[model samples]
Each structure stands twice: as C-alpha cells, then as structure tokens.
Target chain A: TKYHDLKNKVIVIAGGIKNLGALTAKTFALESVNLVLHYHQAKDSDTANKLKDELEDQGAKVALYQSDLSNEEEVAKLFDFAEKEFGKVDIAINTVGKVLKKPIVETSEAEFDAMDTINNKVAYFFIKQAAKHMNPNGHIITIATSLLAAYTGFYSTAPVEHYTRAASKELMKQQISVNAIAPGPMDTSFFYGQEMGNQLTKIEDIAPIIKFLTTDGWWINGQTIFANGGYTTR
Target chain B: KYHDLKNKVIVIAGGIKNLGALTAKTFALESVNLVLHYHQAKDSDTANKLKDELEDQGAKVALYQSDLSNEEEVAKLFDFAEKEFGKVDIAINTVGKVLKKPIVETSEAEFDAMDTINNKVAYFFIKQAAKHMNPNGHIITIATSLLAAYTGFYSTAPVEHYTRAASKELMKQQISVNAIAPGPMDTSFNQLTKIEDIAPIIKFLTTDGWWINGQTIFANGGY
Candidate 1:
C-alpha cells in the first residue's frame, strides 16, 4: 500500500541519466512510481539503462528517450514520447544546466549564446512543452543552484541568477507553481577538480527536498526557494 | 463609474506611438485619462495620429513634448503633466533607445544622449510621477534582458542606469513600483524595419503574479 499510493503516476525527469535528473528518478523509485527519463546527450546511456532495469525489477515502469533539447523539434518529440508512454504527465523535474565561466568583459559571443541558450532557454522550452502535457493539478519543479542567488564572488553566476530568477518568476503565473531549488555548495562532483575543494553538494542532500516539494498544496508560486541552509534566503 | 479613473492620473511618457501607444490605448479602454509625452528631432504627425486613435476610443489624451534626455525639459514636461491630469496614478517609463554605433566610434555626444534618455529620464520620470500616483499606484520602467548578458561596453551607460534602477528604487508606498525587463522585444523602429529579427519572450516583470520589492522580471525568450 505504501508504494502503491504513487504507482502509475507519470513523472518525467529531464536529464535523467545526469546528476540532477538521476537524483529525481531515484526518488520516484522510492515510492515505486512510474518514471520517464529524458536525456539530451545520452552521456551514460548504459548506466541509465541499468538504473531503469533496477527500477522495473522492483515493479515500477521506467522508460528513456534521447534528444537534443536545444533544437525545438527534438525537444517537442521528447515530450510526445513521454505523453504517449504514460498519458498526462503528473510531475516534471528539470535538472539541465549550463555554466559559462567568464568575466563580464571576457565572455565570448559563443559562450554567451551557449550559456543563454542552455541555462534559461532550454529550461523555458521544457516548461512550455510540459505545460501542454501536464494535468491541471500537476507539479512542475526545476533546479537552479543557490550560490547564484547568494552572489558568491563569481561574476558569471550573476547573469545566471538574473536569467533563472526572471524565468522562474514568469513561469509561475500560469498556476503551475514552478520551483527553483537554489542549494549552496553541495558536495557534488562540480567542485572535484576545482579550487572550491570539496565544498559541493552531496547528491543525496540536495535532491530530496525538491522531491518532497512535488507534493500538492505545498508552495509559494512564481517564487524561488533557496534550500542552501541559510547561505541564501528563501 | 465614468469618473472612476478621472482624477486617477497616468503618465505615459513616449506613449503616443508604438508600444507606448498600445499602453495609451489600454488606458483609454479603462477610461483612464493620460499624459502622452514624446521626444522629437521635430514631428507631431505620429503623435497626432495616436491622439485621434485614442480619443476615438474615448480616452482623454494630453500630448506633452520634450527632449526627455534634457533634465530641465523632463522637469517641465512632468510639471505640465501634473497641471493637466490633476494627479497621476501610474508612471510607465518605457522610454529608452539603442544607438548602434560601435563603442570605439561612439561619440561623447551620443553617449550622453543615450545616458540622458535611458538613465536620467528613468529617474526624473519616476520622481515626477511618484508625486501624484497615490499610495498603491505603479512606476513601471522598461529595461532589457541584455542587461544580464552584456556589459555597459556593448550597451550604453544609460542602459546600465536603466538596468540599475529597474532593480533599485527607493520609493516607500503601498506603491507598486517595479521594472519590466522585456526579452528581445520587437518593440521599436529598427526591429520593425530591419531584416534581423528578435522575437518576443514571455514578459515577466509586467505579469500580474509579478509582485515583489527590489525585483526585476526579464522577458528574454529564454535568451
């Protein structure tokens, strides 16, 4: 009964094979819910397939679709696959991200375009498409890091903050209640080769709170919730 | 009912044409009287067309002219607006422009003009309108999404001022003062005529759910 409560609900985790999406897929498994994973590049398709097998072994339905989210046609097709597979989407979590490390003056046009295209544009399109597939009461959750909001000495992070904050605010109007999880310094691999030196988010610590936020009647719409433990205000 | 918005004045500086004209039309739809200000090398033909259009729709349109970049002219324009409208309920400072001259070739006169128009007008227009916008009325300034991606070098100093003020204003009110940062809007002469096109994105700052203090709503179509 505990697991059956969430069974048959359609959950889509864009970037499912990757860091953020992988976390979401794993959380859905805990409740034994049916989950669909969307990955742009298939970075670790073999591992993603392995995870899918494990989830299905436990009696949950799992599927993976691949596409280039930056291109409109592929992004749309990916959504159609999810809809065809599981009917109306009940929950969507987007963990796709882009970081163009550059100073305000030094950023090149290509870098700027890529940053703009991925960080904000891709996220926007996903929500736009997901809205069409979502049931009215469905939940829409997205991940945008917290340190951007906190101004932690990175120049590029500022633009990322502004772009994401503005998009999240606008997305909130349709009553979909878009949430941005801004977590500070998780112990993830994002800092492994960098000088921030192990000051990163642990995949475990950062992912679950957002999974909980997917529950109905629990939010302030069009608002960014900073879950970085006082490093940034919510 | 007819007088509901009679004394509830609204200032639509640069409002007699294009997007500003659209706003003026919205005011007319609500029967809100207006102060429609504009800048000119010299011409009222466009303003005249706009006035007739709005008046035909049943709006009380008062045309005020000035070089908004000039501080004294801005002051005079606002003084005249207050005198006519009785009081202002909203101040939509959607006036600013782009000078495509490359940075190195951009002259001091051009720089100042951009500053005069983008930055100075933003300040005085808000200062001028806040005087009459009762307690909970608004002061919405138009800014751009480029403010996030580009520095003052690619854009002008005035754009920076617009960028800064959209996020920072010291108005104390039930006053719903905020900034509207439209993303890649085709809202001007160049966008209309040019071969190069930038499509509209979701307008965030102006959206109804867009209520906050010291916040900016960017409408760059995810750019």
Candidate 2:
C-alpha cells in the first residue's frame, strides 16, 4: 500500500529466531519478502536453524546472524547483513527485549542496566542503524510492552515505551515511518517466563498487524499500537 | 476550604490575557494577592489594567514582564514573587507556543522555541516553585486536550508527563501538581471555546480540590 509493495521487499528482524519473531518471518515469507533474522544468545541457534529452513520452505530467501545488539557497531552489522543479502531493506523490526519482575527495593543496578540496554539502548541504536540504511519509504518498528500504559508501582517496560515514543517522533520525516507495537502478554514462553498470563494475546494475532503496517497501514505513523486482546485498553 | 486563600501570594504565568487573566480575576474575587507574569512588552498595558482593576477589587496585585523561556529567569520570577509577598502559596503556568505546522516543515529553531516555552519552562517552573513555594502550595500547568487524542503527531505531549512526575516527586512537600487540558478555545493558541467555562475548574483545583495530584484534567467541552 501507499506506493510501496511487500511482495519483493526486503525485511530484517533484529530478533527473529524464536517465538513471535519466527512467526513474523513465516508470515512475511508467505508475502514473498526476503528475510534477515538476528538472534541473541548462542542457545537460540537451533531454533534459528529450524526457522531458516521453514522460511526457505515458504519460498523466501533468508539470512541469519547472532549478536547482542546493544552497541552501534553490532546494530550496523545487522543492517549490513540485510543489505548484503538482499541489496535493500524496506522494513526493519527490532523485537529484542528483556522482562524484569521485581520491586525497586529488590532490583540491582546491574539488572536495571541490562534492561535499560536491551529495552532502551539497543532499540535506540537499532533505530539509528535502520534510519541510516533503510530504503526510502521504509518502515521501522520496535516491540514495546503494553505494561507501559498500565499503572503499577514497578515495571521494566517504561524505558522502552519512552524510547519508542521519542524515536518515532524524530524519524517521521526521513520518509522512514517509525512506530512501535506493544503486544499484550503473549502466549509465548517469552511472556510466560517472566510471570503469569492473565488475558493472553496470541502471536498469531500480532504478526498480521505487523504485516498490515508494512503494507496498507502506511498512513499510521509515529504511533505505538497496542495489539493487546483487550487486556488493557489504551 | 482546606486552607484560607485570602492574602495568599499567587504567581500566574501569562497572567495578562485569555485563561490566565480570567484566572487572575477569579482569584482576585477571593481576595488572593497576585504576582502576574506576561512575556511581551505589548501585553504590559493589559497587565497593568488587570492589576489596577484587581487591586480595586480588594486584592494586592503586581505586574511582572518576564520571558520564562530561560531557567534562571524562571527562578528569578519566583524570587520576585517571594521578594514581593514574602512567600508563594500557589504557582500557575499558562505559557505555550502553539504551532500548527507539520513536524517536517517546522524548523529546528522554531521547534526549540516551542520546547522552551512549553516543556523546559514547565519543568523549571515546577522546580523553582518547589524550591520557593510554601508547604501545601499548589502548581498547575495548562495544556491542550489534543494530547489525549490518538491521531497524528504533535509537539505538545511532554508537559503532561513533566507535571505528573513533578507531582509525585513533590507530593511529600505537600505541593500538589496537576495539568489542565482545555479543548479548543477562542484564543490564538486554541480555537477558543470559552475562558469563563475553564476559570471555575482551575479555581476549584487550587481550593477545596487540592487532593487531586499528579493528574491531567480535561475540560474540553466533550470533544
């Protein structure tokens, strides 16, 4: 949509090996878009290999890389991989995140720093890299949590929400549409590993929205859309 | 009334016209002394007129011309209040630079000025108020209802957060901080529905309505 087509467009997922990222890869593969998947932690390699196979089977070319994308250099490497593999990136999505569940009194500086790096710093650099490398009319999206709008004494998703809001404001004019998607508590292990799932959201329910953003939802810019299945209405 | 507002010192930013002037007039009706702030020298006549009229209405009022865009000047403005009335009991910020232009077309210098008037001034106003204001003092910032709209982008979203955070931080000091988002009005900034409709709500917020803190109240006439 909006003067752009997804059929032959190239996409890079900053954390695309497991769960929702892998599902997004499969969904986009169905659209015939090329893929670049970045995974964090060496333990995710097996899942990465399986996902690569599934993506190829779905009739799309795939490239896989592994890194903790906390610094500018590694973020640049991700874009470089996508550009080298497909020659262009139309949409760049960063789903890299870490969930923290503890009171402020119980939390340590190191834990807070890691969450800040993963949720805020990594997203910042990822957006910077995408702004630099993304094709004109490109779209950049980051994963935020719905807990941002939820009132709580303590939650770790606040920094990511702040970053996503600020970055989206800055990147609106580059012909690069920057936005954020905050899925409610997903049914994936990633969501459940942190805590119990109240009103669980399905990954199947979220990928289509991401696909729509890259296609028909181009008019919706500089916003963080919450695809929560009515868990929290914001 | 939680406390007597009579003779209490109140400093109002943009105190010459529109909602600010109307709010000053309302407080004058209640016998509250005022330190009124206006930005442009052109507004000084209207500021002096309101001061004379309010003074005639049984309130001591002073007019101060100040560009609140600078942090030091904001501090100086509060110090002026303290120097005049000996203590500050309430602080209100109605200063803003509205731009209807698109973010792409808006120049950097223009955007910086808007940020200074709205976000930076709001922050510094709260900071100085906390430093100089007496215990149980109230701080209020004016904003627009478009801040709640889930539509296209705008540049006026941060004031609500700054007011909210400052409310929590200053709650222990018994200083209640809040923001008011009036819908379109008949002013140059907004479409200007009516200032008379907004003045009562603002008055209630600083009087018997002191319990509401860290919140943004929308008075947008149902839009």
Candidate 3:
C-alpha cells in the first residue's frame, strides 16, 4: 500500500518479456498496476505469455502484445492495445535497445543503421506514442545507456537522452513527465553481448527507480537519471 | 590573422577577473570589441581597471554590472551590448557558483542560490545571446569537470542540458553553442589546469574551432 496511488494504474512496457523489462513489469504488477507488456520477436511470445500468467497470479491484470517496436505503426498499435485492455495508459517504459560495441572505423554503415533504428528510432516513436496515448499526468521513461557519460570511444551513440530532454520540455505543458535512466553495464544478455565487469549495474537497482518515477518521483522530469552505481558518471 | 576576430563584438559575463578577465585580455589581443559583465557594485574597480587595460591594448571595452539571475537584467545586459556595439557576435558565460556540501547538509536556500547562479543565469544568458547574436555566432559557457564526476556538485547538470538544448535550438541560425568543463584549476588541485590553459581553447572555439558545436569539452588534463 506504500504506492497506493499506483494501484490499478495502467503501464505499457516495451520489451517487457525479459531482463530489465520483465523485472520492471513485476515491480509494478506487485503494486497492483495493470500491465501492457510488449515483446519484439516471435519467439518471445511464450516467455511473454508466461510472464502475463505470473503477473495475473499476483492480482495484477496483464495484457501481452508482440511487435517490432522500431516500426512506427507497430509502436502505435502497442499503445492502442494498452488503452483497449485497460481504461487508460498512465505510464510507458521503453527498455528496447540495441548496443553495438565496435570502433568507429570498424563499424559498418549497415551495423550503424541497425543500431540507430533500434536505439534512437524505437525510442523516438515509443515516446511519441506514449505522449499521444497516455493520461495527462502520466510518465514516459526510456532506458538509455551509461555510455552517454563515458569518455571511452568503443560503445556507440545515444539520442534517447536528448529525446528525453526535448520531449520532457515539449510534453511539460500536458503535465506528462518524460525521463530516461542510463544504467551502467547490467548483468544480462544485454551486457554480455557488449562486455563488462563484476561491478555491473543490477536490474534490481533500476526497476525501483522506474517504480519511483511513476509514484513519488513524478517531479523528476526531462532528465537522464544515471543509476550506474558509480560505474560511469557525467 | 587566423582568428579574423578583429572588430567583432563579444560579451563576456563575469568577465572582470580570474578566468573571465584572462579571456577578456586574450580577445582584446585579437582586437575584438568587448562588453565585460561583472556582478556586484563592489567589482566596479576591477571592471574599470580591466576596461582600461583592454582599451590600452586597442580593444574597445564596455563595463556592465548586474546580478544576472534576474531575467529582465539579463535582457537589459544584451540590450546594452547591442546598443553599444551594433551587434553581438560571440558570448562567453563564465558566470557560475559552486557548492560542495553533501545532499543531507545542503539547505534549501543554498540549493536555490546554486540553481539561480548555475542554471537560471546560464539559461537567460543563452536566451538573450540567441536573440542578439548574429548568424554563425558562438556561445560558450564555463561548466565544471564535476559534471562528469560522480560527486556532489549538485547544480551543474542543468547547464549541460541547457547547452545541448540551446545548441540544437540555435543550430539553424548557425550559432554554435558549447561548454568547457575544465577540471580543478590552478586555484585548487593536482595536475591543475590554469585559467591560461582554458582561455586559449575558448579563443579557438570562437575562431578556428567553429565547427565544434553542442559539446561539453572536458579540459581537465585527464583529472
């Protein structure tokens, strides 16, 4: 009952089947927040269904949808499905991201385009649809990467940080808060693909921050909260 | 000859002393007209002395005094610069206050002052610069290395956001907006970067380094 205001509020999470996204859904589900979960690949449907049933078992209403959210049309449909399943969409969290770890000289145009599509393009449309569909006082949170603050050259680019700033400013009039969380390398398939150390950021450390943003942390807007446990800072 | 800064008008906020004063002198050597802004009536002596020195160096110098946190005063500063110099070509804001207390010990008043000095001043300065600057103008703000550090220099973050947001908002006008976050200076620390070290970089940005925009240059000597 600590997050009493969150009870039965609708939240749509893209990439909600596994890793950080799944954990975030579970955190909100326990608060009795209704969930609209989106998984990207066809193979993730079983994991998506299993997560849906698990959340439903915990007294949370859950809706499962699948789409390649990088597609603008598909991103719009995800929010449409959320509003249809629940009364309204109150929170939208996009954890969909693609990381490419390569030197600038070595990176191919195709590889760069794919990274940009998945990271920046998906974030842009997800935020657009979230802003378009969410309630007036709702929140939109995007998961960015700690590479944003890193001085190193390997891990590539990020615009979700800028998107959060621009969207937050534009959306402020509607009272819809927009922000991004840039966690340091996390202990997941997401991190293993890139590479990391023992000091990797925990998904557990991050989900609560997402939960807090929906509840007590609503005033924190248009910011990239770096939750990387001193792994990287700027 | 490389700078081509001769006769162009520039506004330097907090420009009477320390790094600001040094930068004013550097630009004066390039023969640019300077509008030097100082806070507090008490700094008038220093402003006057700096004005004389720049004038002696063959640069036209104007002295302005105001607490720039006020939006109206900020606007008036730009108005005064435009009135004196015909147009504003480049603006360098060295106006900022640093607070080092931990989150728990910091008072609301202290926090507010920090925000006013760091965030509010930078925003209005950029706002007015964008309003008054000519096309292809350069806007530079002095930020800190702590912006990248995991330390409690609480109020500096918003300035970076302002830098980015303003850079994009002003890009179409060809006005280049950027920030320089120098590490602990000669005033305080090991591997210390001096005001002398940063003034050249600022000069470069306004001159040959024009292509570098929308970035916070961390000039901390690897600190």
Better of 2 and 3 by TM-score: 3
- Off-target runs (Cα >4 Å) in candidate 3 are A1-4, A98-113, A146-158, A191-197, B1-223
- For residues B21-91, write the lDDT of model 1, one tens digit per residue: 66676557656677888876355988988888887887787888777775577777767877886656667
Fraction of native Cα contacts reproduced by each candidate: 0.00, 0.00, 0.00
Q: How far out, in Å, is residue A68 in model 3? A: 1.3
**Residue-level lDDT tens digits of model 1 in A1-234:** 012156678888877765667766877787657788876555657877988887787777888987767755666777788889888887788776543244435645565555544556666667767777876545666676422332333311133344445544565444454555555555424422111333234555546555544641133234343333212121
lDDT of 2 at B200: 65
Give the poorly placed runs of model 1, Cα more than 4 Å off.
A1-234, B1-7, B97-113, B144-171, B183-207
Which interface RMSD values do the candidates have, in the order shown?
12.1, 15.0, 16.8
Listed per model, the TM-scores of chain A against the true chain A are 0.75, 0.82, 0.84
| lDDT to native, each model | 0.57, 0.71, 0.74
lDDT per residue (tens digit) for residues A1-234 in model 2: 254456888888977877678878888898677899988777768888988998888888888898877678988998988888888788998875644356545766666555555557778888888878888778888877522323231322155556655666676555677777766554335632221424455666667667766664454455555544323322
> Clashing residue pairs in candidate 2, if any?
B185-B191, B185-B192, B185-B193, B186-B192, B186-B193, B187-B192
Worst 10 residues of 3 chain A by lDDT: A148-157
DockQ, cand. 1: 0.01
What TM-score should be assigned to candidate 3?
0.49
